Every structure is written in structure tokens, then in C-alpha cells.
Amino acid sequence: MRHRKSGRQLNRNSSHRQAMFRNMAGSLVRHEIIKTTLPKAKELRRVVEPLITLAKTDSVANRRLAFARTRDNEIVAKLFNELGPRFASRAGGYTRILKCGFRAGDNAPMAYIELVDRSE
Amino acid sequence: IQEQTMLNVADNSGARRVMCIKVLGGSHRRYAGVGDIIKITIKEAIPRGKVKKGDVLKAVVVRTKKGVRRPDGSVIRFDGNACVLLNNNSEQPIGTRIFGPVTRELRSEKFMKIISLAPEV
Amino acid sequence: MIGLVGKKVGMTRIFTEDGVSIPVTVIEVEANRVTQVKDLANDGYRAIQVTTGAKKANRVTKPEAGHFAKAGVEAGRGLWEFRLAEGEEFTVGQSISVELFADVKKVDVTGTSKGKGFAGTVKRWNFRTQDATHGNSLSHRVPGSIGQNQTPGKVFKGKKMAGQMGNERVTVQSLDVVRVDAERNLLLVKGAVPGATGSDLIVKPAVKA
Amino acid sequence: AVQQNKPTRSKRGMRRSHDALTAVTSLSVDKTSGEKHLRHHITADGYYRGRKVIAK
Amino acid sequence: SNIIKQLEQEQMKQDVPSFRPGDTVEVKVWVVEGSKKRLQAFEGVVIAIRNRGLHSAFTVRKISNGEGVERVFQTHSPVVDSISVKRRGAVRKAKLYYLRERTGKAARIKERLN
RNA sequence: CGAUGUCGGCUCAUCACAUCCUGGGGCUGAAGUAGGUCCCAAGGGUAUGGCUGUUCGCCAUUUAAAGUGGUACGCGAGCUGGGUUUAGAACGUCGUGAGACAGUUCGGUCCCUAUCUGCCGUGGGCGCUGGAGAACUGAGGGGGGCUGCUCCUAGUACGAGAGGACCGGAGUGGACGCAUCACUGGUGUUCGGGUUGUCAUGCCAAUGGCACUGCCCGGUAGCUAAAUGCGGAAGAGAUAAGUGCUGAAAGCAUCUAAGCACGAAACUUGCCCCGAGAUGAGUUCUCCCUGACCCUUUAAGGGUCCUGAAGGAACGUUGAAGACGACGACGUUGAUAGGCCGGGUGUGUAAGCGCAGCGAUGCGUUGAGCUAACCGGUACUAAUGAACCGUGAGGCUUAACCU
RNA sequence: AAUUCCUUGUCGGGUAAGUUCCGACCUGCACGAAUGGCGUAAUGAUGGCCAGGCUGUCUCCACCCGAGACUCAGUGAAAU
RNA sequence: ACACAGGUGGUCAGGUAGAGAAUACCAAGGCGCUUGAGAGAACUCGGGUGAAGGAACUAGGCAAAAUGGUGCCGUAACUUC
RNA sequence: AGGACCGAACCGACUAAUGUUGAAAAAUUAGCGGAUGACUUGUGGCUGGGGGUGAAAGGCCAAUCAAACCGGGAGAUAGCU
């Protein structure tokens, strides 16, 4: 079994594990919503909240560490504005998760996953 | 450790690979080292010596690969595999000059002859 | 006679003058007060039950609170048979712990080992493997035979290859103590006690090493 | 191998005594819109406590 | 946790010297004769791993007769006595585990701190 | 003969005793010594290589001993295809030849997803006649049993010496087995670091992709052995071969006929694990439920209104628990997860900037930066809806106590 | 001897152990000179034997990474 | 026999690195292959790394493993030279 | 120069593994040989069954080859199941 490890092979090959969140948190700078599989809305969860923490200050070396997590020049511009600083009003939980039913084609869990602060 | 393996002479009685051919004191051992006596087969030897190659002797390993150990976070591991040749009739060191440091299974005083010919800790 | 209910925690060195690197578990005994004494008049029992540590107390049931309208309360974590012979132990909440004993060097222990599922072949009775590619193909951990033919006709009940591992009682015996205590009721043993960590476990005298 | 006697439904039905589907334990009802969903799942619009969040 | 780190220091010898490994060191360990005790030299070179809250390593290669004999140390065991740092250098990579087989006119160690 | 695949190996063994080792005895041409020989004894154990397809054998070196036989000469719907009978080919030989040879040599397709019985785990029903929540009794079952050597006794008894025990005591291994990641290591493609080629982020810088994980080095947790701790017990009871008392029939004698005593690794316990489906559904402990009505053939109910408890069920956050069921904790009465913060731990001296250097590069800022699985704390987020199920004081007979 | 039955022939070598191997010896059942004899550098997806190298082939097995198996939803065989 | 892991003849040959129609990385251009999503056990298949030992395996090193380039040094038995 | 080497295309098929109710009525995957020649490849033409054709295996001649296929003789005959 899996006991006291947080390692996870997903349903992804190794390299696609580390290269999927540039299209999933690359969606979390566009419309701060995503509707995706729900336990992968829990594996997304742990990726997204340290980003917000790194997004506190632009520096030089946090702007270049956003070139070590994503590299989209366009989105790092969006970063460090209210993405990071707005979420300094709480300590963790920079996203609510919130639970839903199923997908129309076959079954797969639905999620509602979206950042806590936008206008809410 | 292990039967077969290609052992060194610590002593000055032969030279180079001298193969284990029996772990004594029983069987089904994955263990063959330390101060334990083990039947040897000389098949390398120094050619200016007094015996040559294809002989059987016995030995005690004096610098074991997995070395020796006493629980206290101190493990003395020798990187040599060197051994010391012994009569088959009587044991007792055949060396007179012994090179390198010895094991603490013969400083346990099984052989009281072999620590008095061998320098080093 | 009676044991104490400890708890596992995890392993560590246990140092001497020499400073040895030997396993041990720093067992934490909270108070083991007497819930009940079972008698020769209430069947043929002669044991006691007790209560050790606290529980939430807002997550118990009313039939599991109504023998603490017949007893004391400490919010025990279970009710455990500890045999003794005669009476030197008594119904009143004695809240006894490891200081009690201190000469004990053989003690039973009953942790449950590590759970890790159920295992299979080479992990039951730990069979030697078939050959890989220099004599055999298609068997490595694939068990071989399981019988003869028309005699015996059948596969016996004996043999197992794929039963369950752990998650049931197991008992060690021996296990010397070095420290008995009262500060935090810490008990330093010989080591290697079964469990998964934080696994509650007796510490009762035994007649065998 | 394969069937040496064809099964009777006193072998078929037996394996399907333990056929099972969903069990509701009632549907849940919101305390804030009355909506009859199952709890910890979308109502139809993200109606939870006193909200309609991500309104649909 | 709550059962060690306040019941653990009792056995640690924290009062030892500290290094980045790659040193000329002279370890003095209690050798006990059964009658008397004394301090046996282990001139060596540390390859050390960092402390685990209770467990360290300070494996030395003697290079005793051209071929070393190796002894890990810990500085918690009360029979370890005292270890001198003496000269102190280091390899650019901090863990030595294969830069100790480098040899053939290797012994170069250096300091920076930056 | 409408198909029961040959041998050996491998794998897995299981059984019998005509017992090889260990255990107990008898006789001895048994001083001791190591034996000879026979009786009893299945608890447990019982070798690795060279050569050969050989099982087998021989040889070599071990071992406490390397037991024998049975189980379709155990086991191919479990493995191999080496031996071995296909078609190819060749030799020696026989034959007129074609061809042949229980002579020889080289090469030469091992299938089947399991309905059924049987096994190994694990659940689900329904029940033990009020409903629930717990703890055990032990009816029975299963697991477990090895042994050398050293030292002591004692160089004693014994022996003229040489040699060399008994009984008992202690120590240390070998093999086997159980537990455990603390130590010692291994791995460790969620981590850290270095790095070649090329492609890229407009470009410099700095970064990123690909190239078996691109290649390589280091390594935390976890899992794990080669690591580390522990284990085969003492002690009872009743016996075997055997040893006996007491003692007649048969004035003696006679362990046996009467009557009484011991006696082995065998046996029954003791040890360890399952264990009331133990339908023989046990006991012990605790808790909750003590409304009307109608319609009856009526200790059996049928139906209607009002209720439904304890507790359970589900739901959710999840677990050192897990194939799935199952089992465990917590759910704002909150640390159950995640996050968050701090710490540790592991890597090892960032980037940017300055200075030096022609550069390569070095140095300072700065032993910096980064950092999981770990540890301490923290309700930020997720633990929202109660719903639902479960009922309402216990059938009869007989006895005892109360009246 | 791809031939030798008797036959693990006998001796020598190599192995500690070499029923195989290599060199002799001749105990040639049942080799032999174009259905050619005896040699041969060179060659071989060739037979036999050995050595260095390398190693999970083995000692003695572990951990990791994918695709199944397993769970859920949609569709849905087979021999017999 | 299939919208079948197969077969099919001819013509064209960019960029970077490279001896190259090798091979790696990229173009232009064209594709992601007609069940999907979870848990993530045994066992299997397909890969990758292994302390110590090194052919003990086995009929047999079956297989893997290492070896691998350029220039230059240097090369024995034997020989049809 | 050469029935020359190495090695892609191309052409062939020596090993292993996986497959073996296959993706496949002989493939796929990793290896292996040949690769200016007794080479190879397209196109069309031309040899017929007691026959062809065969660097020979009694091999091939529409998944087939110890004398093809189709129709006729034919309801062959079957002391046999």
C-alpha cells in the first residue's frame, strides 16, 4: 500500500507529471476557474498554493523563479500584482475547492475549483 | 565473505588470488569471512617461494570485506580481502611478516600467535 | 501478573556507557485505572479490565458511558483482559503504571505488526524463486506445483502462498527493561516491538523468553 | 477448462444475489434554497449555504 | 516530537568541533584493554554526512598500508572521546562517497565560505 | 487407442518407517577410547561443487547427519526441452537397391482467458424470538520444536601410560524461523546538485525542452536485507524400550498373576495464533424503548392513526488501514486532511549586483540559495442540509420466590 | 575418429574435484586412398574446449519507473 | 476477412550538429493513432538501479552487461607472402 | 583492382523475448548477415500435373504439393466404425 508518502504516479508518465500544470495553472491566470477531475483538483491543490506564496514579491529572483515554474512572460506580468498579495489576508487556503457531480461522457468526477479571491 | 572470491595474501608465503573452496563449521552460509577458518586453494603464488599453485591450505581472513562491527555506530570495514595461511595439520601462522591491519576476531584471542606478527589497528 | 497498556512511537538508539546503537521504543503509559475486577463468583474469571488514556468524550455511545456510571471515568481507549491470580488489585481507580514493576525482563508485548496489505508468493513461507531466462521462461514468482495426481486426489488444506499478513495479534516475549519511570512513565526496552508506530500495546509479564 | 455441465439459474441468480446499485439514504435538502441534491455535491448552480456561487 | 528533542540532547555531544568534510583529522577514541583505557589514533579523512537529530557519520579512510580501513563515528557514543579538526578544507561537492577513490595524487582540499 | 504427453532437471513438496543425526535402553570378545551388535524411538533436522543429459554413479571438500521407500518410477491445464522417436544431414555397418540400424554424430515450433470439485485469503446474507453497544469463557483447530563447538566440572573418573569421560553447569556459533527500520547499508525516474549535443524564451544574461530516466553524481521519507533485536525453553502429567519393589499360584524362585515405583527429542500439557455459525449460536458487562385504535379464525395475527429510542446506516475530511469489501480517527464540541508558518532534514557557497581578470574564470556580497515523504504549532480551505434506517418493556410450559 | 562394440579403454596434461576437453598409446567389434586418403593459410549468424573481460545467470534477493491485472462508467466475445 | 500493430513500386531530400539517406535536436508541413476515468494488491509483461561476491548458475554465460570514436604509438603464432 | 571490408537505403532471414481464443491463417520487438555483386528491384512475356520448375529440401507451382485445381466417371468401393 501507500503509507506516509505523498509521491504520486498519476495516470501520467513521469515527465508528463511535471509538465501538465503549465496547462492547468496556465488556466488559473486566465479566468481563475477550472473544471477538471476532482481528486486531480486535490493534486492541483498543492501546486497552486505554493505558487501564490512565491508570488508574494516580484524581486528579480522570484520573477526568475517564475521562469522555473511556467515561463509565459505574459502571465508572470499578471503575477505579483493581486496574485500573491491579495491572498496575504489569510494563511493558506488561497483556493476553495468545492465538490460536484459527474461528467456527461462515461464517469469521472466533476470539480468547480477556483481561486478564493477575485471578487468573492 | 562468500565462498569462491579471490583473496589476497596478507602474509609473505604466497601472492595474489587464493580461492575459498569451503565455508567450514556448516553449510548454507552466505558468510565466509572474519577470523573463521576456511579451507583454501592456492592457485596463485609467488614463484620464488617454496610452494606454487593448485595447493590447498586453510586461512583466517585478517582484513575482511564487510569487516567487523560492534554496535555503537562503529563499524570497522577493511577494503582488503587479505588472509593468512595456515597448516592443515596444526594451523599456526605460516607467515613471519604480515602486512596491513588485523581483525578484532583474532584480537579476541582465538589465535594468540597472529596478532604478534602483524602490525596495525 | 497484570500488564500495562503502553503505546509505540518509533525506534531510536538506547545508549549505555559504551553508547550502543540498539533499538527501543519510548512507551507512554497514561494511567491504567481499574474499571472492574472479574471474579470467581461472576463465572470462573479472575481478571481485571481497565482503562488507559483519554478519548474525545463527545464521540462515545451511551452504553459505553454507562459502565462509567458504575465506574470512574478517564475516557479509556479500550477494555482489556488482564489475568491475575488472587487479589492484590482492586476495583478503585488505581491509575497504576510502569513504576510498579521494575524487575521485569520478560514481558509479552502484543502489537499487531506492520500492516502492508496481504502479500503473495515468496512472502508467505518465503519460497525460493524459479529461474529467470537461463533455464525457465514465464515463472519467477509464479508458484510451481500444488500436488501429485489421483493420490491424494486433491490439494490439501496445508500450504498457503497468499494468505493475509499482519493486522492481527502477535506476541514477542523476553525484553529486558533499563528504565522504569514515573516522570512521563517511560519504559526503555530491548527493542524491535511490532507495530506501525503509535500502536497501543500491552506490556505484561511472561514465563518464557 | 470449460463447462462440462451447463449451469442452472440456481448458479446464475446466486452470484447475483449480491448484485447491488445505489442507495440514497434520502436525497439531501438545502437549508438555504430547499434544493434537493445529495450533500457535498452541486445542487445545479453551486447553491450551498446562503449562496449561489458560480451561479448556473 | 514530544517524547524526544527534550530527552535526546542527553546523549548528544554537541560540544564537538564542526567542519565541512575533507580534513586532516586525528580522532582519539577510547580503546579498552579490559584493565585500563587509552586513546588510539585514527589519522584519516572525513567524508561526513550531516546530523539527523541524533545520528551522524564521520567515516574516515585511514589509508593504513596504502589501502584504507574505514571507521564511521557519530559523536554521541560516550566512548568516542575527542576529535580534532586540525587542517580543514573541502571538495566543491559536499558529499564524498566516490571522491575518495579518486586518488593517484589526490588530496587537494580547500576553503571558501561564500 | 472417439488421444491417460516419455525420462531427467526445475519448482513445490507431502506421506510411510524397514531411523542417517539428535533422544532412551540391552548384550558385548564395552577399561576409557572410539566402537561392534540388538531393542525402543517419526519431535525436529538431514551438504555444496567437478565430470556426466544420466536420475543413478564416481570423485572432491564439507557436515551433527548428508537416511530409505511411497505419492500416475509424486509434480509439463506450474516452468524447461537437456536426454528422448518427426521430416534435414553425415559417419560406421547391413542391403542388389530403395532404404534400414532398441549403433553413432550435428541442426531441428511445449497450446488452452478455468464452468465444476478441491485449496489460500477476505467479505456479504440470515439467525441465536424486544432492540442495541461492548468484554471474554474455551468447545475445538492450527502454528512452534534443530544442532555442533568452546569453556567449566575435569585433564577429574577411568587408564601403568598414551589417551581420556559420566552426570550436571555456563558460554559462543552454524543452519532455520519471528519481529524491526533505531543503527549499517541498498534503492529512492515526487528531491538537491553537476553536465555534453541541440532546439527554444525576440536577443545579452539568466532560464526551459528533447536527446534510454538525455547522461552522471549525491540523497530524505517509505520500503527493504547484506542491517538490527528476538525465538525455538524451563517445568508438570501419563508413558515406551527398559529398570523396579512387594509376591503367591509352583513351601523355593519368580517386576506380575493381586497390589504398589520409576523411566525417552515419542505422548498429554506448558508456549504462540484463530476461536460461540461451539445452530452445543454459551457467559459476563452496559445501554435504550414501558401510546392509542379498529378487524379478527386469535399465546397466531391483520389492518389504521400517533410515534420511533439507544444505536445504526449513509454523507464528508481522511488514516502508519486497505485489491474490493473490511477496520481506524475526526467533521466547527474541530487538528481529520490539505494548505500556512516555524524547525528539522538533504543537498552545498544562488540569482542579481560589485571587484579583479583580455578571457576562461576567480573572489566578495553569501558556507548562499533551494528543499519530500519528516517534526512542532496554526482552522486559512475542505470537513454544508439535520435527511434515512432502527421502534414502542419481552410467546408459551413448568418450577422457585413475592403476594 | 561425427567410425571403437568391450569402454568413464590405458597413460600424460589441465581441474582440488576434468564420465567432457587436449596430447600420446593402439585393445582398428565394424578407417583407408576421386560413392578419394592425409595435410592446409584464410574463412564460418558452424561443432567441441578454455582463458581474460563483464556482469542479478547464480549466491540471495531488494528498491524504483511504465503497460495490465484490480475499482467505476460506456460498449461487449469465445471455445465448451 | 476489419477504419486490421502487416504488404506496396516511382519522384522530391530544408536548418543545426554530424563522414552521411547514420543519428540527435529542429523546420515547412502533417499528425496525438474511435472506449474513457480511478484505485495504484498479488502476479505478469515492458523498462531502470542495485551492498558484497563474480558463472558458484545451467545440459549451455540463454540473456543482459560491458566493448565502441578520431589521430597517433604499437602488434605474436602462423602464411597461399 | 577486388564473387574486398565497415555500414545506411535496400535486400535477406541466424538468436532471443513477447505473442501463441494473436494486431498477425508465421507477425511484432530487441539483436544478426549481405550491401558492385554467383547482387537486387519494376514492368511485361514465356514453361502445366505421372507434368513443369528446382545451386536438391521430394522443395515450389493461389495459406496446400510423394505427381495442383474444376467438372464428369460417381451414389467409386467400404468382409469396416
Side-chain angles (χ1 to χ4, degrees):
Chain A
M1 315 298 321
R2 324 189 284 177
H3 291 153
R4 314 297 159 182
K5 301 175 286 299
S6 294
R8 282 302 318 285
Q9 67 294 110
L10 309 179
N11 297 95
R12 304 268 73 147
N13 53 86
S14 296
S15 315
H16 205 179
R17 306 179 322 219
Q18 306 184 269
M20 57 211 278
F21 298 111
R22 306 195 159 190
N23 297 119
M24 297 169 169
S27 307
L28 281 151
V29 271
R30 308 201 302 268
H31 35 64
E32 304 51 79
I33 54 181
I34 182 173
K35 302 305 156 54
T36 185
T37 51
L38 183 69
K40 304 309 182 191
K42 297 165 181 188
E43 289 282 276
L44 179 60
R45 161 183 63 171
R46 311 179 69 169
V47 165
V48 178
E49 305 156 276
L51 174 51
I52 305 315
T53 300
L54 178 280
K56 288 292 182 289
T57 41
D58 179 77
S59 313
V60 187
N62 295 49
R63 158 69 75 99
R64 294 173 181 209
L65 279 174
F67 289 149
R69 173 148 54 157
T70 83
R71 204 168 74 161
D72 312 304
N73 306 327
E74 297 284 3
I75 87 188
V76 302
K78 307 173 184 184
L79 299 171
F80 330 102
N81 296 352
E82 287 299 276
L83 294 53
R86 182 169 46 202
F87 296 84
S89 59
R90 57 217 305 124
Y94 308 124
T95 184
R96 317 181 179 262
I97 293 140
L98 303 162
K99 298 163 267 69
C100 292
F102 290 100
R103 172 179 67 173
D106 297 358
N107 277 9
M110 174 63 188
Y112 237 35
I113 180 76
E114 47 67 49
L115 293 199
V116 58
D117 294 312
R118 176 157 56 269
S119 297
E120 273 83 53
Chain B
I1 326 302
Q2 278 93 198
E3 206 188 278
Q4 201 164 63
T5 311
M6 305 300 181
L7 304 163
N8 285 315
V9 285
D11 59 4
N12 57 7
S13 303
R16 308 175 309 253
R17 315 182 164 175
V18 293
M19 314 66 171
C20 194
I21 53 167
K22 194 56 74 163
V23 293
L24 297 178
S27 286
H28 324 286
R29 320 186 48 184
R30 63 216 66 68
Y31 297 131
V34 305
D36 195 72
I37 309 171
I38 59 178
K39 202 79 168 184
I40 301 295
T41 291
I42 317 301
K43 217 188 277 219
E44 314 293 317
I46 193 66
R48 300 279 73 257
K50 62 301 176 61
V51 302
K52 299 304 156 270
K53 307 176 179 61
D55 317 274
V56 298
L57 288 162
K58 287 168 177 171
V60 292
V61 189
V62 287
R63 284 189 69 174
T64 304
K65 179 53 171 170
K66 291 290 254 278
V68 277
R69 187 175 166 164
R70 203 283 309 211
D72 49 304
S74 292
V75 178
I76 292 182
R77 183 209 62 225
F78 309 80
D79 285 298
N81 302 78
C83 308
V84 166
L85 309 182
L86 320 142
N87 298 297
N88 295 287
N89 297 273
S90 48
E91 314 312 308
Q92 310 304 88
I94 304 172
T96 53
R97 296 282 180 269
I98 322 278
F99 299 100
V102 289
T103 44
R104 36 166 178 200
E105 194 65 72
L106 293 160
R107 311 180 272 181
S108 290
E109 293 304 296
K110 302 295 93 51
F111 277 79
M112 294 69 153
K113 311 89 203 185
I114 204 146
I115 67 285
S116 305
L117 294 160
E120 303 171 25
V121 169
Chain C
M1 302 151 203
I2 72 288
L4 288 321
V5 172
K7 186 180 186 50
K8 197 181 164 178
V9 45
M11 293 305 168
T12 32
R13 294 180 190 163
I14 181 183
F15 288 64
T16 45
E17 193 294 290
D18 305 43
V20 297
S21 288
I22 295 296
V24 61
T25 298
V26 205
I27 290 157
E28 318 88 331
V29 179
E30 292 58 32
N32 284 246
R33 82 161 186 76
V34 204
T35 314
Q36 62 170 328
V37 192
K38 313 306 302 92
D39 309 281
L40 296 183
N42 282 112
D43 206 57
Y45 308 137
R46 189 69 305 291
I48 64 171
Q49 307 290 125
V50 294
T51 41
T52 313
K55 198 191 168 196
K56 188 45 159 61
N58 300 287
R59 281 301 269 201
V60 304
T61 52
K62 178 57 189 80
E64 308 311 296
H67 50 269
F68 294 143
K70 300 286 159 56
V73 60
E74 180 195 348
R77 302 166 306 182
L79 309 301
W80 305 282
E81 200 188 65
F82 292 102
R83 272 301 195 243
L84 49 163
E86 313 87 44
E88 292 82 44
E89 279 60 68
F90 302 103
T91 179
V92 295
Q94 296 183 340
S95 297
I96 53 183
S97 290
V98 308
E99 58 280 310
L100 183 54
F101 291 121
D103 314 74
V104 285
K105 302 284 170 287
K106 292 189 301 193
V107 284
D108 287 279
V109 199
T110 305
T112 48
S113 308
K114 191 63 161 62
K116 202 56 176 184
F118 75 110
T121 313
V122 182
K123 292 189 304 319
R124 184 97 294 98
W125 308 117
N126 312 326
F127 323 100
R128 227 286 294 177
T129 54
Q130 305 65 54
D131 214 78
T133 184
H134 203 182
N136 277 335
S137 71
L138 303 156
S139 296
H140 329 83
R141 314 195 62 167
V142 166
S145 48
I146 67 172
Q148 287 68 229
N149 288 301
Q150 294 187 25
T151 307
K154 54 196 189 155
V155 175
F156 303 108
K157 288 167 72 295
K159 202 62 52 67
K160 304 89 168 68
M161 52 301 178
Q164 177 163 19
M165 55 96 74
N167 317 294
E168 70 87 57
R169 307 198 301 118
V170 280
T171 278
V172 194
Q173 299 179 105
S174 205
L175 304 154
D176 312 289
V177 307
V178 197
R179 181 185 177 167
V180 286
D181 191 20
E183 170 188 75
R184 282 174 276 150
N185 303 281
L186 303 169
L187 183 62
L188 301 176
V189 295
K190 200 77 180 52
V193 300
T197 74
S199 306
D200 293 291
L201 43 76
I202 53 182
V203 59
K204 180 167 222 285
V207 290
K208 178 168 181 152
Chain D
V2 280
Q3 295 80 83
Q4 302 293 314
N5 206 51
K6 197 174 49 183
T8 159
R9 313 287 56 130
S10 313
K11 306 204 189 53
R12 179 58 173 276
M14 317 312 281
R15 304 185 284 205
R16 298 188 307 184
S17 305
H18 295 303
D19 286 358
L21 301 143
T22 193
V24 291
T25 323
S26 202
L27 295 180
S28 307
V29 57
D30 281 62
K31 299 179 296 201
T32 50
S33 47
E35 292 182 60
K36 290 288 305 186
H37 67 307
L38 179 60
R39 72 197 305 280
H40 301 75
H41 300 285
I42 190 173
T43 51
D45 59 282
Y47 224 107
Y48 312 112
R49 54 277 158 151
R51 63 190 63 176
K52 195 184 176 60
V53 281
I54 325 292
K56 287 281 189 198
Chain E
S1 297
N2 301 310
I3 202 67
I4 53 188
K5 312 195 180 199
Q6 87 294 102
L7 188 73
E8 174 172 284
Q9 71 293 325
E10 61 185 16
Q11 276 303 310
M12 305 163 58
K13 302 170 47 273
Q14 306 116 318
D15 287 292
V16 288
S18 293
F19 33 92
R20 186 62 76 195
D23 293 351
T24 302
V25 279
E26 213 311 284
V27 195
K28 297 77 61 185
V29 283
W30 297 110
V31 62
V32 189
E33 280 72 51
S35 320
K36 50 182 166 51
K37 305 171 64 176
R38 60 194 161 109
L39 291 170
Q40 206 63 249
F42 219 117
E43 175 51 62
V45 56
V46 279
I47 63 142
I49 197 165
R50 28 186 289 180
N51 179 246
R52 273 161 278 175
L54 190 43
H55 323 277
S56 306
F58 298 129
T59 317
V60 297
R61 286 201 66 187
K62 220 170 204 304
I63 307 289
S64 189
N65 61 289
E67 185 179 21
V69 40
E70 273 72 47
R71 194 165 187 159
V72 59
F73 296 105
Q74 75 317 99
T75 55
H76 314 277
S77 292
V79 299
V80 69
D81 187 59
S82 185
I83 175 179
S84 57
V85 50
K86 317 202 290 184
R87 192 258 153 91
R88 185 204 175 257
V91 176
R92 191 261 87 209
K93 293 185 145 294
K95 188 70 178 52
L96 294 50
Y97 208 57
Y98 74 117
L99 306 157
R100 44 170 182 168
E101 304 305 298
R102 196 60 56 229
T103 77
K105 204 188 166 167
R108 293 81 200 72
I109 51 179
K110 51 172 176 51
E111 293 164 88
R112 183 161 180 187
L113 297 180
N114 187 86

